[PDB]
Amino acid sequence: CTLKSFTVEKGIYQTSNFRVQPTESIVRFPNITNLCPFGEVFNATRFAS
Amino acid sequence: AIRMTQSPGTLSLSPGERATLSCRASQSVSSSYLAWYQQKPGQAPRLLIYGASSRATGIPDRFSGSGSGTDFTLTISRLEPEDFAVYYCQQYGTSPSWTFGQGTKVEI
Numbered sequence: 001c002t003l004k005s006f007t008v009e010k011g012i013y014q015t016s017n018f019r020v021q022p023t024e025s026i027v028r029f030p031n032i033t034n035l036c037p038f039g040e041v042f043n044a045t046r047f048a049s
Numbered sequence: 050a051i052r053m054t055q056s057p058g059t060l061s062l063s064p065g066e067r068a069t070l071s072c073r074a075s076q077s078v079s080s081s082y083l084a085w086y087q088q089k090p091g092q093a094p095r096l097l098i099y100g101a102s103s104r105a106t107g108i109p110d111r112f113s114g115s116g117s118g119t120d121f122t123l124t125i126s127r128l129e130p131e132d133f134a135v136y137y138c139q140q141y142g143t144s145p146s147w148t149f150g151q152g153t154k155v156e157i
């Protein structure tokens with residue numbers, strides 16, 4: 001397929017690339033224990049000028 | 050632990066007058082996290098004010114909230130036959146640490 005031919009002559013042909021695929025996914029976020037106070041911004045009684 | 054107290058202990062007024070209830074905090078409480086509830090006997094608390102100045106859905110405009118720091122105020126401009134029930138002030142937040150007042154009773 002790389003040579004686009006059904007006959008292959010004697011030689012060495014680079015046909016593809018090899019890649020070790022990942023095994024699993026890792027997530028590392030900071031150890032945070034607070035909720036963002038978005039209520040007092042989006043739910044304020046009076047927005048500023 | 051913040052302590053929320055209410056004044057007066059019992060408020061006696063006639064219908065059509067002006068009612069003012071005060072909530073005192075042992076510390077400085079953010080005005081964004083103060084609520085006012087009205088509870089008639091035999092019922093669940095009804096949220097009147099949140100954010101210390103915003104009225105819940107269906108609340109008559111005769112109720113108003115104000116204040117900051119340690120002093121917060123719930124003002125009823127014109128008492129009505131339905132506006133005579135217990136009143137609580139609550140301090141809350143985005144953290145699991147809330148507090149309630151001891152209750153102020155408005156009577157005829």
Ligand SMILES: *[C@@H]1O[C@H](CO)[C@@H](O)[C@H](O)[C@H]1NC(C)=O
Nearest residue numbers: 027028029030031032033034
């Ligand atoms: C994250 O913090 C909590 C305390 O807030 C602690 O109990 C927990 O062990 C911490 N976790 C890590 C991975 O540091």
